[PDB]
Ligand binder design. Structure first.
Ligand SMILES: COc1ccc(CC[C@H]2OC(=O)[C@@H]3CCCCN3C(=O)[C@@H](C3CCCCC3)NC(=O)C3(CC3)NC(=O)COc3cccc2c3)cc1OC
Length: 128
């Protein structure tokens, strides 16, 4: 499935070039602008452990998820990955533990040393 395809063929979007954050565009977005550090960004998403059977269903998929880009409000993989998205884009993102919850995890749902997989839809962003 998509997690395996992204693992094998995804673009490495990390500064270290450690394949720690891998991306494949699912739906091409609009324009060329991407969100900038400090912007408020608004997304829809689905996430899971990369080997999991189903996407987690413990948020309202209709409500935007909002955060300030590049401020460490979300896991590193999202700060890196959302920065690369155009408005309207949907991507797949595969996140190795160092760019997610690392050795501590977030128990019980996220074990220690967990690789994560997301589908992210960028709705909007603004610099206000
Ligand atoms: C700077 O590093 C961090 C900053 C914040 C956190 C707290 C968790 C943070 O969640 C995430 O960053 C990511 C990506 C944004 C959507 C949610 N998320 C998750 O990992 C998922 C997760 C669920 C289980 C399968 C794997 C993905 N979390 C969720 O979807 C839920 C259940 C609903 N939890 C939350 O969204 C809790 O609220 C927030 C709100 C902001 C940041 C994070 C969590 C953890 C961090 O490092 C470990």
């Amino acid at each position: 499935g998509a997690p395996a395809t992204v693992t094998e063929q995804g673009e490495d979007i990390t500064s270290k070039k450690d394949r720690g954050v891998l991306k494949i565009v699912k739906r091409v977005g609009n324009g060329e602008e991407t969100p900038m550090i400090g912007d408020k960004v608004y997304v829809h998403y689905k996430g899971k452990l990369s080997n999991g059977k189903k996407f987690d269903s413990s948020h309202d998929r209709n409500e935007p998820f909002v955060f300030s880009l590049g401020k460490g409000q979300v896991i590193k993989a999202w700060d890196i990955g959302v920065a690369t998205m155009k408005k309207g884009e949907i991507c797949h993102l595969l996140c190795k533990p160092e760019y997610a919850y690392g050795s501590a995890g977030s128990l019980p749902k996220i074990p220690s040393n967990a690789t994560l997989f997301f589908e992210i839809e960028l709705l909007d962003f603004k610099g206000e």
